[PDB]
C-alpha cells in the first residue's frame, strides 16, 4: 500500500454535484438580491416538487412566516435537506465556510456524500497515524506551537498526519503559516509541537500530485523525472540490472531529499551519487511517492480489461483507447518513462532488461489497485506488469 490512501479522494469523485440550479419561470420576484435560484415565497410541498428525485438538484425560498429568512434545499437521495442560509458579505450554511454559492452546494454536497459513507472510519483516522514518519520530521539537517490557519488548497493535497485525503472545494483543512505544513482541521488538534519553522523554505517536490507539481512548475513533465533520466542515460545505461537492481536505500532517501529544494531543479550527478542504482532508486521512488498513480486509479479498472485480450491485435488498440483517457501529465510522464526506459531494452545485451523484465519493477509502482474489493486484485497484478511490459514494446506507435 501506498503511504498516500485513495479511499476519501476516490469517494469526491464519486459524490453529486449541484444538479440544478433549477431556475424559475423568470418570476423576478422582488424581495431578492443576488440569485435566479430563488423561488422567492413557497411551500416545501411545492418545493420538493421542483426538485424531486433529482439527487443534487438544490432551490432557494424565503420563509412564509418570519421574512427575510431564506433557506436553502438540496436533495440528496435519500430525502431533501433544508439549511438556512445566511451572508457575511458572502453565501454561506453553517459551518464556517462561507463560499460564492453553487461553490456551497457542491462542496455541501461533497461533504455530505463522504461524511455518509464512511464517516466511521473519517473518525479513526487519528488512531495509528502516520506523521511520526514521513518526512523530514524524521531526516533532513524542543517545543514551539504551530500558527495554524485553515487554507484552500489548490490542487489534490493530504494530511501530513493521517496522510489521507482533504476532501472539500476550498474547505480543507489548515497550512502551519510558520513551518509550512498541511493536515486536516481536526488532525491539527493531535499533531504534537515541534514544528520547524525554517523547514518551510523546502517545497516538496517529492509526494505532491503529478499534474500539480507540473501545472506549479510550468512543465508538462515532473522535473525529478527529466534529470533523473538524463543521468541515467549519460551513465550506466548498460549498467546490468537497470532498475532490478536496489541501491543504498538510505541513499536513495539523499537523493529524493535533494530534489525537495537543497536544489530542487538544481539537484545532482554521477559521483556524490556513483552507484547509478541509487538514481534508478530515486526514480522509481518519484513515481511511488505520487498520490495518485501514473496510471490513475479510475484508469486501472479498464487498462486491466485490456490486456486480458490475449489477440495482440486489440491489445494494443485497447491500451491505446484506454492510454488516451489519461490525465496529460499522467500521460506526458508515461511517454517519457517509456523511452527512456524503453531505449533500456535496446541493450538487454549488457543490462539484461528487457520489456517483460521491467514490465515487472514497473508494472507495481506505476499502477495501484483502487482497494476495498481485495480478493481477484491479487489474481490482476500479473496484467499490471504486463501492461507496462506492452508499453515499453510497442513505445513507438501509442506516443
Ligand atoms: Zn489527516
Ligand atoms: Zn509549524
Not at 46 to 66: C, K, N, P, T
Request: with cysteine; glycine share 6%; proline share 5%.
Amino acid at each position: 500500500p501506498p503511504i498516500w490512501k485513495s479511499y476519501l479522494y476516490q469517494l469526491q469523485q464519486e459524490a453529486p454535484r449541484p444538479k440544478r440550479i433549477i431556475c424559475p419561470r423568470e418570476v423576478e420576484n422582488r424581495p431578492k438580491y443576488y440569485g435566479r435560484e430563488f423561488h422567492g415565497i413557497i411551500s416545501r410541498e411545492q418545493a420538493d416538487e421542483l426538485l424531486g428525485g433529482v439527487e443534487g438538484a438544490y432551490i432557494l425560498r424565503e420563509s412564509q412566516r418570519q421574512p427575510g429568512c431564506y433557506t436553502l434545499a438540496l436533495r440528496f437521495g435519500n430525502q431533501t435537506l433544508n439549511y438556512r442560509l445566511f451572508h457575511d458579505g458572502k453565501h454561506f450554511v453553517g459551518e464556517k465556510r462561507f463560499e460564492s454559492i453553487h461553490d456551497l452546494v457542491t462542496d455541501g454536497l461533497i461533504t455530505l456524500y463522504i461524511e455518509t459513507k464512511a464517516a466511521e472510519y473519517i473518525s479513526k483516522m487519528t488512531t495509528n497515524p502516520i506523521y511520526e514518519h514521513i518526512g523530514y520530521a524524521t531526516l533532513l539537517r524542543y517545543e514551539k506551537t504551530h500558527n495554524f490557519k485553515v487554507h484552500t488548497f489548490r490542487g489534490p493535497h493530504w494530511c501530513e498526519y493521517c496522510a489521507n485525503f482533504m476532501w472539500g472545494l476550498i474547505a480543507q483543512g489548515v497550512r502551519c503559516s510558520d513551518c509550512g505544513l498541511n493536515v486536516h482541521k481536526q488532525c491539527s488538534k493531535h499533531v504534537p509541537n515541534d514544528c520547524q519553522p525554517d523547514l518551510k523554505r523546502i517545497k516538496k517536490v517529492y509526494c505532491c500530485d503529478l499534474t500539480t507539481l507540473v501545472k506549479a512548475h510550468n512543465t508538462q513533465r515532473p522535473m525529478v523525472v527529466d534529470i533523473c533520466i538524463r543521468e541515467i542515460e549519460a551513465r550506466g545505461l548498460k549498467s546490468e540490472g537497470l532498475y532490478r537492481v536496489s541501491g543504498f536505500t538510505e541513499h536513495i532517501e539523499d537523493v529524493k531529499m535533494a530534489f525537495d529544494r537543497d536544489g530542487e531543479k538544481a539537484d545532482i550527478s554521477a559521483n556524490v551519487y556513483p552507484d547509478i542504482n541509487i538514481i534508478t532508486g530515486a526514480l522509481k521512488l518519484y513515481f511511488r511517492d505520487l498520490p495518485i498513480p501514473v496510471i490513475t486509479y479510475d484508469t486501472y479498472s479498464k487498462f486491466i480489461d485490456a490486456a486480458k485480450i490475449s489477440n495482440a491485435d486489440e491489445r494494443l488498440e485497447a491500451v491505446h483507447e484506454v492510454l488516451m483517457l489519461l490525465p496529460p501529465a499522467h500521460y506526458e510522464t508515461l511517454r517519457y518513462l517509456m523511452i527512456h526506459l524503453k531505449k533500456v531494452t535496446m541493450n538487454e545485451k549488457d543490462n539484461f532488461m528487457n520489456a517483460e523484465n521491467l514490465g515487472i519493477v514497473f508494472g507495481p509502482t506505476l499502477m495501484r489497485p483502487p482497494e476495498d474489493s481485495t480478493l481477484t486484485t491479487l489474481h490482476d497484478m500479473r496484467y499490471q506488469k504486463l501492461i507496462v511490459q506492452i508499453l515499453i514494446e510497442n513505445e513507438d506507435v501509442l506516443f
